[PDB]
Scaffold this active site. Structure first.
Site, PDB file in Angstrom:
ATOM      1  N   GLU A  71      -2.925   6.121   4.329  1.00 50.19           N
ATOM      2  CA  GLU A  71      -2.539   6.565   2.980  1.00 50.19           C
ATOM      3  C   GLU A  71      -3.302   7.808   2.479  1.00 50.19           C
ATOM      4  O   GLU A  71      -2.703   8.664   1.826  1.00 50.19           O
ATOM      5  CB  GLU A  71      -2.687   5.415   1.968  1.00 50.19           C
ATOM      6  CG  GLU A  71      -1.774   4.202   2.216  1.00 50.19           C
ATOM      7  CD  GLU A  71      -0.292   4.556   2.458  1.00 50.19           C
ATOM      8  OE1 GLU A  71       0.242   5.507   1.836  1.00 50.19           O
ATOM      9  OE2 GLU A  71       0.354   3.863   3.273  1.00 50.19           O
ATOM     10  N   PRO A  88       0.817  -1.209   0.000  1.00 49.65           N
ATOM     11  CA  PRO A  88       0.000   0.000   0.000  1.00 49.65           C
ATOM     12  C   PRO A  88       0.856   1.267   0.000  1.00 49.65           C
ATOM     13  O   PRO A  88       1.637   1.502   0.923  1.00 49.65           O
ATOM     14  CB  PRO A  88      -0.931  -0.105   1.213  1.00 49.65           C
ATOM     15  CG  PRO A  88      -0.255  -1.124   2.129  1.00 49.65           C
ATOM     16  CD  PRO A  88       0.496  -2.033   1.158  1.00 49.65           C
ATOM     17  N   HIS A 116      18.613  -0.443   6.852  1.00 54.87           N
ATOM     18  CA  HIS A 116      18.962   0.984   6.874  1.00 54.87           C
ATOM     19  C   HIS A 116      20.479   1.251   6.897  1.00 54.87           C
ATOM     20  O   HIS A 116      20.921   2.327   6.487  1.00 54.87           O
ATOM     21  CB  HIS A 116      18.217   1.664   8.030  1.00 54.87           C
ATOM     22  CG  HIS A 116      16.726   1.720   7.780  1.00 54.87           C
ATOM     23  ND1 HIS A 116      16.084   2.607   6.945  1.00 54.87           N
ATOM     24  CD2 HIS A 116      15.776   0.839   8.223  1.00 54.87           C
ATOM     25  CE1 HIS A 116      14.782   2.287   6.898  1.00 54.87           C
ATOM     26  NE2 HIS A 116      14.541   1.210   7.667  1.00 54.87           N
TER      27      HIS A 116
END
Ligand SMILES: *[C@@H]1O[C@H](CO)[C@@H](O[C@@H]2O[C@H](CO)[C@@H](O)[C@H](O)[C@H]2NC(C)=O)[C@H](O)[C@H]1NC(C)=O
Ligand SMILES: *[C@@H]1O[C@H](CO)[C@@H](O[C@@H]2O[C@H](CO)[C@@H](O)[C@H](O)[C@H]2NC(C)=O)[C@H](O)[C@H]1NC(C)=O
Ligand SMILES: *[C@@H]1O[C@H](CO)[C@@H](O[C@@H]2O[C@H](CO)[C@@H](O)[C@H](O)[C@H]2NC(C)=O)[C@H](O)[C@H]1NC(C)=O
Ligand SMILES: *[C@@H]1O[C@H](CO)[C@@H](O[C@@H]2O[C@H](CO)[C@@H](O)[C@H](O)[C@H]2NC(C)=O)[C@H](O)[C@H]1NC(C)=O
Ligand SMILES: CC(=O)N[C@@H]1[C@@H](O)[C@H](O)[C@@H](CO)O[C@H]1O
Lengths: 191, 593
Positions: B355, B326, B485
């Site tokens: 969203e 999404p 990361h």
């Protein structure tokens, strides 16, 4: 030198805006002038907000001007199905820059490199100097403010309105008018 | 002189919004309809975008930035005049590009093998993280945890040792003393009269807020340790640091998956409305109109129409190859759309608000220049989505929207079961989210030297996080580089900053709405002035600094952690009641080995 039924445009609901600035539109069946001039072109919806008397910004300063004293109206409608294209449409042009903000109805259909500050330039148009003509890029999936709209401007003696007539009653006492004349009486068929 | 910069940036903004559209639309078409023609198309479109941006940037470099008076054109010149790369020698530039692809391919493709049967192996996410999220076998968790580090993390050690050099040469050649000072540079503010903010100022301000959080985390650590001794008996001390392989994933990044081992009162049904959604037979269209209703209710405009046709909310009846992840898409030209393929679950009913809360900010700053259509800092841009998901999750919202019965009762033990699940997620990550960036900032400047990189990491795991190595380690490892990361080159500090701004936004709008109770109960459905206070930050883009925009939302010119703490005072009061008999905090000397 023709009749002009503005009442059709005023009533037809296809227009996204129908807005008058020197006239109130229903009176146009009676109001008359030597000429009327139609201007016609395609624009982005949020920027149609710059097409009125006395306004400012990218269209109002650098396309063409309606004066603050504009004797006329302005109409506009959705053109998505025609004037936007899937690969984008780029046929439409605008000149983004020009020294001196334009005068009423003035046309600067000429182009040279605009240029800014104290500097000399001869084409090239990367740094300090830029070619002021640019294309639009109308695409159907744009937001409603970046979609294309057809726009028409009308600046408002020979162009009169539809001076409609009554039914005619014969052999009865009647308050008549014919052309630019009036009178009262009984209207009988003569020989 | 400023008119040269102004009309350069007017030409740039008029060109860039078209080239970015035909690039990001091909990127959209690829992600929703995967074919090799769509790949080759969206790549050659991205090429033409990047070529334009760099070919303009060499002109942006010629304008003298000190000859600029207005903030909003200075900010646009500085954003286009930046060099970033090309500062490096061309061979060192290609070497850095090679290293980034090398660390990226090693992390994404890395295999861990089984010592009982070497013909069977695991990739990171399927099977190997599944052990760490759902297995209770200490020896299998420990195998997956140490085999990831020794079989893949050790490959990244000698690459991270060269990445730090080439990133520091890039940062220096940009006139930043280290690459961490380059990253901090997002939050930098200057020349705005008192609203200014130094690159270094974040370093002390994050620690000045983190030392307020510690008492909540020390009682949560004591509570979770006292629980985990029942899940992992004899392995855990009642006073020690926690063994890192027992922490709910491969890294201990979130304790959220420890809930079944740590739950307060699991006999109270932790509330769900997925049953109400299927009993009312809701689809994606209904879910998203019931999501839109919240925004037009609080005082925001409804969607740009073509949203509904051009977005994908569900999976296509065709057996399509697409990414179902999404995602909120801004393409430029006012073109707003979500890419997802929803299933009837309350997680997606909340994700529709999550969203859409991205799109509603992207719409409000659509009046700003292309260079400035972004969040006021990298913490704003996600926190502004989550404050919609917070309100939609409340029981008062859920009964008002028709997703709970009018006769249903909420109770304290339902509050504590929810709030601990929030705390394991929201609070428990913050020592790690501060510690990883502290370690990396001290590595980039060389405050941690290349013969003590891993030595200092496990001292900081024990001192800051209260977490201990399951087995001893040395400078052949890189346990930092065992994570996305660190291996894929992403700044992590945004997540600390977003975790303050989220509650600072919420509590200000909840006070503007005059909410009558605990902050986690707050609803802005059928408010109006909450939407007015939200909107005045929403329509600035980057053109004003976050230190100015925060005082219009929050009433503070800086980040403050108080609102997060408040959100947890009802749970902390109970955690202080549960552990009265226990030791609280940890010994950094203790180890499981
Ligand atoms: C430079 O700053 C000034 C104000 O600091 C901006 O001026 C505004 O411009 C808009 C039109 O773009 C007008 O509607 C406002 O009335 C102006 N405000 C004032 C108080 O004059 C100006 O836009 C900035 N320059 C640029 C290129 O954006
Ligand atoms: C960007 O990198 C360049 C080196 O490639 C730095 O030096 C500039 O060199 C160019 C010629 O290639 C000159 O036109 C500039 O005047 C030099 N810099 C300036 C403007 O002083 C340059 O300093 C770097 N720019 C930044 C963002 O610091
Ligand atoms: C939830 O609320 C109930 C109701 O007050 C609490 O039960 C009380 O607990 C205290 C402390 O042990 C006793 O002195 C009271 O007599 C209890 N009241 C009743 C009616 O039984 C309960 O402790 C609360 N639970 C939590 C987790 O806060
Ligand atoms: C907040 O807004 C919702 C939706 O507009 C309100 O729901 C309506 O409530 C009335 C009174 O019970 C019903 O007659 C309507 O049918 C409801 N609307 C819908 C679409 O179902 C809700 O009452 C409001 N709540 C508050 C406290 O303002
Ligand atoms: C401000 C505004 O016009 N909001 C509209 C609302 O009037 C309309 O009822 C609704 C239907 O989808 O869409 C939105």
């Amino acid at each position: 030198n023709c009749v002009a039924d503005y009442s059709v445009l005023y009533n037809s609901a296809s227009f996204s805006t129908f807005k008058c600035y020197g006239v109130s539109p229903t009176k146009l069946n009676d109001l008359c002038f030597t000429n009327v001039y139609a201007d016609s072109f395609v624009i982005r919806g949020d920027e149609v907000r710059q097409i009125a008397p006395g306004q400012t910004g990218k269209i109002a300063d650098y396309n063409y001007k309606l004066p603050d004293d504009f004797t006329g109206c302005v109409i506009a409608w959705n053109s998505n199905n025609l004037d936007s294209k899937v690969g984008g449409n780029y046929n439409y042009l605008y000149r983004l820059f020009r020294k001196s903000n334009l005068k009423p109805f003035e046309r600067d259909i000429s182009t040279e490199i605009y240029q800014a500050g104290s500097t000399p330039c001869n084409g090239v148009e990367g740094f300090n100097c830029y070619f002021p003509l640019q294309s639009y890029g109308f695409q159907p999936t744009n937001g409603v403010g970046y979609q294309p709209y057809r726009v028409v401007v009308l600046s408002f003696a020979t162009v009169c309105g539809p001076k409609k007539s009554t039914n005619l009653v014969k052999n009865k006492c009647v308050n008549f008018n014919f052309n630019g004349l009036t009178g009262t009486g009984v209207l009988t068929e003569s020989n | 002189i400023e008119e040269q910069a102004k009309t350069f940036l007017d030409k740039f903004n008029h060109e860039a919004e078209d080239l970015f559209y035909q690039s990001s639309l091909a990127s959209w078409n690829y992600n929703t309809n995967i074919t090799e023609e769509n790949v080759q198309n969206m790549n050659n479109a991205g090429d033409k975008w990047s070529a334009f941006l760099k070919e303009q940037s060499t002109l942006a470099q010629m304008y003298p930035l000190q000859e600029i008076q207005n903030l909003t054109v200075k900010l646009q010149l500085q954003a286009l005049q930046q060099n970033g790369s090309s500062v490096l020698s061309e061979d060192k530039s290609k070497r850095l590009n090679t290293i980034l692809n090398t660390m990226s391919t090693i992390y994404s493709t890395g295999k861990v093998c089984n010592p009982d049967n070497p013909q069977e192996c695991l990739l990171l996410e399927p099977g190997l993280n599944e052990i760490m999220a759902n297995s209770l076998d200490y020896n299998e968790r420990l195998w997956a945890w140490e085999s990831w580090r020794s079989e893949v993390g050790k490959q990244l050690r000698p690459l991270y040792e060269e990445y730090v050099v080439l990133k520091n040469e890039m940062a220096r050649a940009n006139h930043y003393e280290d690459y961490g000072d380059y990253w901090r540079g997002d939050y930098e503010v200057n020349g705005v009269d008192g609203y200014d903010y130094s690159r270094g100022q974040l370093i002390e301000d994050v620690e000045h807020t983190f030392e307020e959080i510690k008492p909540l985390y020390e009682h949560l650590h004591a509570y979770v340790r006292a629980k985990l001794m029942n899940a992992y008996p004899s392995y855990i001390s009642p006073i020690g640091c926690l063994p890192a392989h027992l922490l709910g994933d491969m890294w201990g990044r979130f304790w959220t998956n420890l809930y079944s081992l740590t739950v307060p009162f699991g006999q109270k049904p932790n509330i769900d409305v997925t049953d109400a959604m299927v009993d009312q037979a809701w689809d994606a269209q209904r879910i998203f109109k019931e999501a839109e209703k919240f925004f037009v209710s609080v005082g925001l405009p409804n969607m740009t129409q073509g949203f509904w046709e051009n977005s994908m909310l569900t999976d296509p009846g065709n057996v399509q190859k697409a990414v179902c992840h999404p995602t909120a898409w801004d393409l430029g030209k006012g073109d707003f759309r979500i890419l997802m393929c929803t299933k009837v679950t309350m997680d997606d009913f909340l994700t529709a608000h999550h969203e859409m809360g991205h799109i509603q900010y992207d719409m409000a700053y659509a009046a700003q220049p292309f260079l400035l259509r972004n969040g006021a800092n990298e913490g704003f841009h996600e926190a502004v989505g989550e404050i919609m998901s917070l309100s939609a999750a409340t029981p008062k919202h859920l009964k008002s929207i028709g997703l709970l019965s009018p006769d249903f009762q909420e109770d304290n033990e339902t509050e504590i079961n929810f709030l601990l699940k929030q705390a394991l997620t929201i609070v428990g990550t913050l020592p790690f989210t501060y510690m990883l960036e502290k370690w990396r900032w001290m590595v980039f400047k060389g405050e941690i030297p290349k013969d003590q990189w891993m030595k200092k990491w496990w001292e900081m795991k024990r001192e800051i996080v209260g977490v201990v190595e399951p087995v001893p380690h040395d400078e052949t490892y890189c346990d930092p580089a065992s994570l996305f990361h660190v291996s894929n080159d992403y700044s992590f500090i945004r997540y600390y900053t977003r975790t303050l701004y989220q509650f600072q936004f919420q509590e200000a709008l909840c006070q503007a709405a005059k909410h009558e109770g605990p902050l986690h109960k707050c609803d802005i459905s059928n408010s109006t002035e909450a939407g007015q206070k939200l909107f005045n930050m929403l329509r600035l883009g980057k053109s004003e600094p976050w230190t100015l925009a925060l005082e219009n939302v929050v009433g503070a010119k800086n980040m403050n952690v108080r609102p997060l703490l408040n959100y947890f005072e009802p749970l902390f009061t109970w955690l202080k009641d549960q552990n009265k008999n226990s030791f609280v905090g940890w010994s950094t000397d203790w180890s499981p080995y």
